[PDB]
Design a protein around this ligand. Sequence first.
Ligand SMILES: C[S@@+](CC[C@H](N)C(=O)[O-])C[C@H]1O[C@@H](n2cnc3c(N)ncnc32)[C@H](O)[C@@H]1O
Ligand SMILES: C[S@@+](CC[C@H](N)C(=O)[O-])C[C@H]1O[C@@H](n2cnc3c(N)ncnc32)[C@H](O)[C@@H]1O
Lengths: 245, 244
Amino acid sequence: NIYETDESVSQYCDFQYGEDCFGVLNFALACATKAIGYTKETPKNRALDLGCATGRASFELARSYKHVDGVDYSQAFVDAATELQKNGCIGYSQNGEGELKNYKVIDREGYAFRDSFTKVEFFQGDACNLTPQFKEYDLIMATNLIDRLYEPRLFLENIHKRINEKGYLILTSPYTWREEYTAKKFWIGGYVDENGKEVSTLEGLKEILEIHFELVATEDIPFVIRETSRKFQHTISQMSVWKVI
Amino acid sequence: IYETDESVSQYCDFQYGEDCFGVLNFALACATKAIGYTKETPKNRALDLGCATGRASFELARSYKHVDGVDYSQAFVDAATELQKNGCIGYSQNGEGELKNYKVIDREGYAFRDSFTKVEFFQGDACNLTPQFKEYDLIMATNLIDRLYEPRLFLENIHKRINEKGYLILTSPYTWREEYTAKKFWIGGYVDENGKEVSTLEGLKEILEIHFELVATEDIPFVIRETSRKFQHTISQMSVWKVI
Ligand SMILES: C[S@@+](CC[C@H](N)C(=O)[O-])C[C@H]1O[C@@H](n2cnc3c(N)ncnc32)[C@H](O)[C@@H]1O
Ligand SMILES: C[S@@+](CC[C@H](N)C(=O)[O-])C[C@H]1O[C@@H](n2cnc3c(N)ncnc32)[C@H](O)[C@@H]1O
């Protein structure tokens, strides 16, 4: 699992807690902020940050929610988030030219979320088969998760059972389906079906989710993730907001 | 309708498609900067080494009497030659997943249409250039050195192909990787045996200052599309070298 490697841990520490690039705002804060707004009429007792990686969006959701669970399949990601939460700091290696690295520190006390980090709990877990304790959520937010899932339907077709009535499921994805993560037969979109029609992922999401959800809003949210000091990925993820029916 | 493949299509889109995120076309920017740095040189012969689908060759032909564009990839060379000859090529832009958007490049849609007959495209290797590729007032090799297995083989001899007072202009984001370059051949981006970090610009000075003077450096951004929603946004460093 690439998500268990230290380079991957360092990459997501930088993306989630490092400095903004090319004028693009921090992605985890943008998503959590937009998610809180979309759910402003809800009780805001329990939220789930699914695929939380190094946990930045869990901390941000906890500024508004009474309890936040951060879940990720990578134990390495979970350890890093927990270490920052409990020790108050974590270090990471920022990439430079070639193999060169720059040591950086993330200080929990340098961020506004320092007022709410005890309302978070991080767990290792599988989004496609969550254990029963992860239930009764007002909000379930899964940013850039579905196109990394071995079988996205296992999560999507069942997630409504974990959300309270009038609760929300908020997804984002750039829809970068790849066989290294998901067999083509399981791509939600980005394929030509057996009748020569082009299936968009949002269409495939409507088909799965409109059984139990109403689609409330979509919006494009850019993000930049560093690869080296000179090479970056600059991506436009699509957020979709679903209200339990 | 000449049709290009995915690798060629990516460079077709990158070199001839629309500007992404407000970033100026990379090939035009590099050629324009090269022209600016060489304004007191003769303007007879320019080599665009690693020219891919040839946009910078066309752009350099607006100022030089003759421009050679050379690339290792025959497929890249044929795309450029086709756009030069027939005036149009088609390519497959990537969208979501496997979905593709077909696009057409029209030679007459660009200002370099006034100079395209002054370019010749060839297949060739920067580390083993044929002897006819000589007597250049300018050799421009953008984003090439960190794609070479042994870049020093190209760099230590290249002054032989450049006229007196001529220029060597390089760009690179210095993304040294063992899949392209043997670690022992990395010009920078590594820790030497004494624990000191070697910068690629310094490695370049060590190789090139035998026969060149470093005149200028400048950061140039570019955006290359990978899908409809995913793009690589990179800052390449241009270095400008005048032959002694
Ligand atoms: C592209 S990253 C997105 C991370 C974070 N949500 C963000 O937006 O930056 C995908 C994340 O999903 C996690 N993940 C992948 N498959 C998973 C699964 N089956 N269950 C839970 N998390 C998973 C990965 O470990 C990784 O942290
Ligand atoms: C990263 S692309 C840069 C292309 C273009 N100059 C630009 O700036 O976008 C590297 C290019 O160099 C070419 N190339 C790779 N190895 C080469 C070699 N040994 N000799 C000549 N061209 C080579 C590749 O085919 C490709 O077109």
